[PDB]
Amino acid sequence: KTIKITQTRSAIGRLPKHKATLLGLGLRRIGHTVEREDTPAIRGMINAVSFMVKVE
Amino acid sequence: MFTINAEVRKEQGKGASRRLRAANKFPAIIYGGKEAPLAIELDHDKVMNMQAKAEFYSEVLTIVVDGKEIKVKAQDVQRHPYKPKLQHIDFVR
Amino acid sequence: TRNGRDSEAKRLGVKRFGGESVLAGSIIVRQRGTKFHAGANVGCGRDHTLFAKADGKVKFEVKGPKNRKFISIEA
Amino acid sequence: MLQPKRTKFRKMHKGRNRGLAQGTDVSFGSFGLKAVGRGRLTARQIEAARRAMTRAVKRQGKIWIRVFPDKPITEKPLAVRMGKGKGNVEYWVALIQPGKVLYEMDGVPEELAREAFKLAAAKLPIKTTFVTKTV
RNA sequence: GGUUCUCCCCGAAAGCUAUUUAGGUAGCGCCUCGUGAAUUCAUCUCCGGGGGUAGAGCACUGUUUCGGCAAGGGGGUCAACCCGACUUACCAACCCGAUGCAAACUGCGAAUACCGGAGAAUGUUAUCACGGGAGACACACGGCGGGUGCUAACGUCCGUCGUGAAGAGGGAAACAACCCAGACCGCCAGCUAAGGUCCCAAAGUCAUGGUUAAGUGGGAAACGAUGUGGGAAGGCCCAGAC
RNA sequence: UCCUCCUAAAGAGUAACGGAGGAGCACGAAGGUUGGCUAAUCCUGGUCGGACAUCAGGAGGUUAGUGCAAUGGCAUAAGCC
RNA sequence: GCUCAACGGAUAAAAGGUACUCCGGGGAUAACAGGCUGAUACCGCCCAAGAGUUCAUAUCGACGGCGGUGUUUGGCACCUCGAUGUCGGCUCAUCACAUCCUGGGGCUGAAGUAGGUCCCAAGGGUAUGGCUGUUCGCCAUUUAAAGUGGUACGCGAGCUG
RNA sequence: UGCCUGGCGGCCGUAGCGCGGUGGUCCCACCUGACCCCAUGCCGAACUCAGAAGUGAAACGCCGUAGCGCCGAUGGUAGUGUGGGGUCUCCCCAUGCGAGAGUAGGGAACUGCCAGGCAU
Ligand SMILES: [Mg+2]
Ligand SMILES: [Mg+2]
Ligand SMILES: [Mg+2]
Ligand SMILES: [Mg+2]
Ligand SMILES: [Mg+2]
Ligand SMILES: [Mg+2]
Ligand SMILES: [Mg+2]
Ligand SMILES: [Mg+2]
Ligand SMILES: [Mg+2]
Ligand SMILES: [Mg+2]
Ligand SMILES: [Mg+2]
Ligand SMILES: [Mg+2]
Ligand SMILES: [Mg+2]
Ligand SMILES: [Mg+2]
Ligand SMILES: [Mg+2]
Ligand SMILES: [Mg+2]
Ligand SMILES: [Mg+2]
Ligand SMILES: [Mg+2]
Ligand SMILES: [Mg+2]
Ligand SMILES: [Mg+2]
Ligand SMILES: [Mg+2]
Ligand SMILES: [Mg+2]
Ligand SMILES: [Mg+2]
Ligand SMILES: [Mg+2]
Ligand SMILES: [Mg+2]
Ligand SMILES: [Mg+2]
Ligand SMILES: [Mg+2]
Ligand SMILES: [Mg+2]
Ligand SMILES: [Mg+2]
Ligand SMILES: [Mg+2]
Ligand SMILES: [Mg+2]
Ligand SMILES: [Mg+2]
Ligand SMILES: [Mg+2]
Ligand SMILES: [Mg+2]
Ligand SMILES: [Mg+2]
Ligand SMILES: [Mg+2]
Ligand SMILES: [Mg+2]
Ligand SMILES: [Mg+2]
Ligand SMILES: [Mg+2]
Ligand SMILES: [Mg+2]
Ligand SMILES: [Mg+2]
Ligand SMILES: [Mg+2]
Ligand SMILES: [Mg+2]
Ligand SMILES: [Mg+2]
Ligand SMILES: [Mg+2]
Ligand SMILES: [Mg+2]
Ligand SMILES: [Mg+2]
Ligand SMILES: [Mg+2]
Ligand SMILES: [Mg+2]
Ligand SMILES: [Mg+2]
Ligand SMILES: [Mg+2]
Ligand SMILES: [Mg+2]
Ligand SMILES: [Mg+2]
Ligand SMILES: [Mg+2]
Ligand SMILES: [Mg+2]
Ligand SMILES: [Mg+2]
Ligand SMILES: [Mg+2]
Ligand SMILES: [Mg+2]
Ligand SMILES: [Mg+2]
Ligand SMILES: [Mg+2]
Ligand SMILES: [Mg+2]
Ligand SMILES: [Mg+2]
Ligand SMILES: [Mg+2]
Ligand SMILES: [Mg+2]
Ligand SMILES: [Mg+2]
Ligand SMILES: [Mg+2]
Ligand SMILES: [Mg+2]
């Protein structure tokens, strides 16, 4: 399995944990479309930053 | 001896309960005996007009749920904190 | 006023939580009363400090009749 | 007026006042006055509303005061700078949440209870409604 | 008070502790340069945890209201060292029943946080140690938790986070810190976030169904009112209702 | 200056001319070890004896005790001989 | 061997005055003024136990409540210490309405006159002297009335001091 | 192996209290006596030593008992992490975690090892 994450808001004002989650997923600029696997871990990261990512 | 129409509520939590209380239908439970509890939801108009008269907290009630009648008794009601509104009703079979 | 004073806090509490691989003689719990009593190879010090007598993994246990919260050390 | 005759500590924290109330049901009497707003009653306001409703029902049938002031509110004086300790303790308040039943009454008609609790509710800072007993 | 040429890379703090010390300084926390070191460090899933906060509760420390039956105090027919017999609709302790409150209460107790192990991905080694160089130790406001204060202050003092400081642009008319957002340079190219689309002023005098008659929108309370719309229950009424 | 609780936001820390308290010692036994023991209060009865000395028994089970301020502890007693 | 207790202890050993003052600095930190709260003040409004011959509301309204203004006494330390001159008087004023007169009314426990209180209204008008530095006051005597406030407690590159 | 009893546990109130009934061949307790070994800030009460007549009263153990205590779901509510909104001393919406008290109800413990008795 391989899904596409995309950023949709920016990581300026956010917490250290959300900065770290976006750095760990590897989405730098907004409008970044990255490919990741489908682990419960990556599903948990998308659960943690659900307000600024967009999964397909 | 009242006949209240219920409906089996799908999902339960804080969110679906507050959405039901927004949409005028307070939830309630039926426990008692060895059978499982059952998650019903009722209209607010009918049950406030029924619980006005004090035989509702007194006698054997009857719930039309899924067509099948259930004899039941009102046990334990949580009211609203500062309103004439109902929150939840414990029913015992 | 009369109420400026306060002491300098003595850094109590638990140091190695359960499942941390302790070395010998290390300090697990600093406390003033025996909140945590000692069990399988934990020594109780002078001020009721709990020091691990032997190597292994810390493992809290709730044994005894009055529900006292003992500390053990596995291997 | 209404103050605790003995306390552990003289001056208390301010503290917030959030969350819903506890004494919602009319336990003792038959007709109760339920506070729907949120604020602090005082000893002055409780004694004023009690003597108003006693004048209202003309001392027939029992009154119940349910909340009692036990939290001291202090006031620094005038022409006093901001430092130099917490100020002297002046008067006592009673915290009210939405839902607290303040007064109860029995041994009165319903309509006379309505008039009495109106007359005493117009001397209290928090918005209140009427309520009756249920079973 | 002042410090004189240019470009490139990284880039803080206004904290702690101690100080005849508070506007200075030293060590550490934070930065930079160099070297070395191991999946070292971060985010997430699962696992091992310990609390005693929010909440709640009244068994304990207190506080409090009411009711029940009372030892013990204060009124006395009748006499009064005597025995005070008996009481008035008295007060009042332990108890029990119901009701509240607590930073200095816990017979209960979450969320997050924190620490330790395994795992996958990712991150320009982001972590650690050493050595060269500092700067800084006057912070501010906003969100949440709170202590003075008046649940006053663009008040003061803390915890955590963000932004300004050290950050341009767009919005809020204007408006360091509020909302979107991180400027390497050029283009008379396109998509879009916060916010908007009658005109000043880029874009809907756009569609569907209501509500408002007040310029409400576009500063505001106790309380008062047959303003008007919606719901539900009603109590008199085609044997005559208002 | 030093100690205890709160402030203090469920690890540690965390301020103010914030809220309450104490120390600047004692001990040759009040330490060590062995062996033994279990309190506060209330009720009933009893010589002087009085609400309160001592004695019997009960109900109660830490509501006592720690040389000392508060907190955490304590029955295996860290309490008492 | 030192209450080196100002407790990380400057010395073994040390109090004061300056309006005769001087220098370095600060709006990092005060007085006047502005700003931000508005506790208090001033004016409103809400409930009505009374008083008013009977009568809550002609007129006051106890016990309590919710505001408004910035308007006294305060709070904070934002601006100014390489300076904004700070009380009062004279001379000029101008604005607001919470009106002192004059204008219009409603109620009256309004016979008339004189009134009381409330609503609209700011066009004009709004005192001379005694004492004090005064604002304020008390007093004498008029007036239709001798308004309440702001304007850096207006105004010293206009004037006494 | 069927039960009963003694010991040392596992466990920590569903395991504790209360009320009633029951067991002495064996075991246990009470008991008999104590200059004695040993003991009492006095006392064979305790502690200990000789023993076995009696009893199962007390104590202990077993059995019934919902009078307490104790445990306790399903639902709901409070709260709160993250994001957003408002009339912003307080809340509300999307989402994730979800108490305490109470309710139906549960509830007179269970278990290992050895030794002894009874027909087993
Ligand atoms: Mg929610
Ligand atoms: Mg709080
Ligand atoms: Mg509360
Ligand atoms: Mg950079
Ligand atoms: Mg910073
Ligand atoms: Mg010092
Ligand atoms: Mg010094
Ligand atoms: Mg200096
Ligand atoms: Mg609380
Ligand atoms: Mg607490
Ligand atoms: Mg370095
Ligand atoms: Mg400094
Ligand atoms: Mg500093
Ligand atoms: Mg500072
Ligand atoms: Mg700061
Ligand atoms: Mg802050
Ligand atoms: Mg706050
Ligand atoms: Mg504050
Ligand atoms: Mg500030
Ligand atoms: Mg503030
Ligand atoms: Mg900017
Ligand atoms: Mg801009
Ligand atoms: Mg604006
Ligand atoms: Mg602009
Ligand atoms: Mg850039
Ligand atoms: Mg849009
Ligand atoms: Mg223009
Ligand atoms: Mg246009
Ligand atoms: Mg149109
Ligand atoms: Mg309005
Ligand atoms: Mg008619
Ligand atoms: Mg802590
Ligand atoms: Mg913490
Ligand atoms: Mg011993
Ligand atoms: Mg006696
Ligand atoms: Mg000892
Ligand atoms: Mg000078
Ligand atoms: Mg400055
Ligand atoms: Mg000033
Ligand atoms: Mg104002
Ligand atoms: Mg005021
Ligand atoms: Mg009248
Ligand atoms: Mg009036
Ligand atoms: Mg008044
Ligand atoms: Mg002004
Ligand atoms: Mg300043
Ligand atoms: Mg400041
Ligand atoms: Mg200025
Ligand atoms: Mg100056
Ligand atoms: Mg200049
Ligand atoms: Mg007017
Ligand atoms: Mg008139
Ligand atoms: Mg004018
Ligand atoms: Mg005009
Ligand atoms: Mg003036
Ligand atoms: Mg002024
Ligand atoms: Mg002036
Ligand atoms: Mg002044
Ligand atoms: Mg002048
Ligand atoms: Mg001038
Ligand atoms: Mg002079
Ligand atoms: Mg014997
Ligand atoms: Mg027996
Ligand atoms: Mg639940
Ligand atoms: Mg529960
Ligand atoms: Mg049982
Ligand atoms: Mg039993």
Swiss-Prot record, chain A:
Keywords: Ribonucleoprotein, Ribosomal protein. This is Large ribosomal subunit protein uL30. GO terms for cellular component: cytoplasm; cytosolic large ribosomal subunit. Belongs to the universal ribosomal protein uL30 family. GO terms for molecular function: structural constituent of ribosome. PROSITE patterns: RIBOSOMAL_L30 (PS00634). Gene3D superfamilies: Ribosomal protein L30, ferredoxin-like fold domain. The gene is rpmD. Part of the 50S ribosomal subunit.
Curated annotation (Swiss-Prot), chain B:
The keyword NADP does not apply. CDD domains: Ribosomal_L25_TL5_CTC. It comes from the Bacteria. Keywords: Ribonucleoprotein, Ribosomal protein, RNA-binding, rRNA-binding. GO terms for molecular function: 5S rRNA binding; structural constituent of ribosome. The keyword Plastid does not apply. It holds the Pfam family Ribosomal_L25p. GO terms for biological process: cytoplasmic translation; negative regulation of translation; response to radiation; ribosomal large subunit assembly; translation. GO terms for cellular component: cytoplasm; cytosol; cytosolic large ribosomal subunit. This is one of the proteins that binds to the 5S RNA in the ribosome where it forms part of the central protuberance. Binds to the 5S rRNA independently of L5 and L18. Not required for binding of the 5S rRNA/L5/L18 subcomplex to 23S rRNA. PANTHER family: RIBOSOMAL PROTEIN L25/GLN-TRNA SYNTHETASE, ANTI-CODON-BINDING DOMAIN-CONTAINING PROTEIN, RIBOSOMAL PROTEIN L25_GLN-TRNA SYNTHETASE, ANTI-CODON-BINDING DOMAIN-CONTAINING PROTEIN. Belongs to the bacterial ribosomal protein bL25 family. Part of the 50S ribosomal subunit; part of the 5S rRNA/L5/L18/L25 subcomplex. Contacts the 5S rRNA. This is Large ribosomal subunit protein bL25.
From Swiss-Prot, chain C:
One of its GO terms (molecular function) is rRNA binding. Pfam families: Ribosomal_L27. SUPFAM superfamilies: Ribosomal L27 protein-like. The keyword Cell membrane does not apply. Keywords: Ribonucleoprotein, Ribosomal protein, RNA-binding, rRNA-binding, tRNA-binding. InterPro entries: Ribosomal_bL27, Ribosomal_bL27_CS. The keyword rRNA-binding applies. One of its GO terms (biological process) is ribosomal large subunit assembly. Part of the 50S ribosomal subunit. Cross-links to the 23S rRNA. Cross-links to the A and P site tRNAs. Belongs to the bacterial ribosomal protein bL27 family. This is Large ribosomal subunit protein bL27. It comes from Escherichia coli (strain K12). The gene is rpmA.
From Swiss-Prot, chain D:
InterPro entries: Ribosomal_uL16, Ribosomal_uL16_bact-type, Ribosomal_uL16_CS, Ribosomal_uL16_dom, Ribosomal_uL16_sf. Is hydroxylated on Arg-81 by RoxA. The modification is nearly suppressed when E.coli is grown in anoxia. The modification (3R)-3-hydroxyarginine is found at R81. Coiled coil: none annotated. One of its GO terms (biological process) is ribosomal large subunit assembly. Keywords: Hydroxylation, Methylation, Ribonucleoprotein, Ribosomal protein, RNA-binding, rRNA-binding, tRNA-binding. Disulfide bonds: none annotated. The keyword Transit peptide does not apply. One of its GO terms (molecular function) is rRNA binding. The modification N-methylmethionine is found at M1. CDD domains: Ribosomal_L16_L10e (cd01433). GO terms for cellular component: cytoplasm; cytosolic large ribosomal subunit. Part of the 50S ribosomal subunit. Cross-links to the A and P site tRNAs. Interacts with assembly factor DarP(YjgA). Binds directly to 23S ribosomal RNA and is located at the A site of the peptidyltransferase center. It contacts the A and P site tRNAs. One of the last ribosomal proteins to be assembled in the 50S subunit. The simultaneous presence of uL16 and bL36 probably triggers ObgE's GTPase activity and eventual dissociation from the mature 50S ribosmal subunit. It has an essential role in subunit assembly. Belongs to the universal ribosomal protein uL16 family. PANTHER family: 50S/60S RIBOSOMAL PROTEIN L16, LARGE RIBOSOMAL SUBUNIT PROTEIN UL16M. This is Large ribosomal subunit protein uL16. The gene is rplP.
